[PDB]
């Protein structure tokens, strides 16, 4: 029920509509859909901590208008 931003290495800001219950695997699947970057070689960084494929955004305390970073 919220929007998050992902900052690439070319400094563009991808907007994603996600639910706090959504996992990291499906959010990077959404990244693949909107961009074309397959989840293999894809890591998301919230604040120092790279996100894990089995967790949701909730246990990472993600909220609306949060900024993740995309590497590899």
């Amino acid at each position: 029920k919220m929007f998050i931003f992902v900052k690439t290495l070319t400094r563009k800001y991808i907007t994603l509509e996600v639910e706090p219950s959504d996992t990291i695997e499906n959010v990077k699947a959404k990244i693949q859909d909107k961009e074309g970057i397959p989840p293999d070689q894809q890591r998301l960084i919230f604040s120092g901590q790279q996100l894990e494929d089995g967790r949701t955004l909730s246990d990472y305390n993600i909220q609306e208008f949060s900024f993740l970073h995309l590497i590899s």
Partner: protein
């Protein structure tokens, strides 16, 4: 970055939520972290030369945002009496003279679509397209449809203009340059190539 950009975040969200559930017309993307430049996109209103086109916009937000409207500019080229054909500047009352607090981003994009759907050649930004809009409305409609198909991804084209633009590009000229030269010089192929 003062607490009146809470408003720009609320309005960004309002635009993004209104887009899905209510329409598909307008859209906004982020440019900077500090919420000061955005990339908007409006859809071509129906029954106009801009129908079927999607026009992009750059929006810069002032530090006094709730007052003193944002600076909006057209990225994709449009053929409109109230929009500059080269700079992209917008002659709209709510962007300079009649802005008000309690106006949203979404409000501005909807107003820009309404402007594309109802021009005003008496308060023009570009005098050439305004004069063409007043003196030869049919050629204006065809020319703006041409510009839509060429720049904003509109579907269909007029072959009479396309043959002229091809014959001039064959001379080793620039497609956008010959387009502006043909459109400004009443599509007189003979005097357009004279514009050098």
């Amino acid at each position: 970055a003062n607490i009146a950009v809470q408003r720009i975040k609320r309005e960004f969200k309002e635009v993004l939520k209104s887009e899905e559930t209510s329409k598909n017309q307008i859209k906004v993307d982020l440019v900077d972290e500090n919420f000061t430049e955005l990339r908007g996109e409006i859809a071509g209103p129906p029954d106009t030369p801009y129908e079927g086109g999607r026009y992009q916009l750059e929006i810069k937000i002032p530090e006094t945002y709730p007052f003193n409207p944002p600076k909006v500019r057209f990225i994709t080229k449009i053929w409109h009496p109230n929009i500059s054909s080269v700079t992209g500047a917008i002659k709209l009352d709510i962007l300079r003279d009649q802005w008000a607090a309690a106006m949203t981003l979404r409000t501005v994009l909807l107003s820009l679509q309404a402007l594309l759907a109802a021009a005003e050649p008496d308060d023009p930004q570009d005098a050439v397209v305004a004069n063409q809009y007043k003196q030869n409305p049919e050629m204006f409609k065809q020319t703006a449809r041409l510009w839509a198909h060429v720049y904003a991804g509109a579907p269909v084209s007029s072959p009479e203009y396309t043959k002229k633009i091809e014959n001039l590009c064959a001379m080793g000229f620039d497609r956008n340059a010959v387009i502006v030269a043909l459109s400004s010089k009443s599509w007189d192929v003979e005097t357009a190539t004279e514009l050098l």
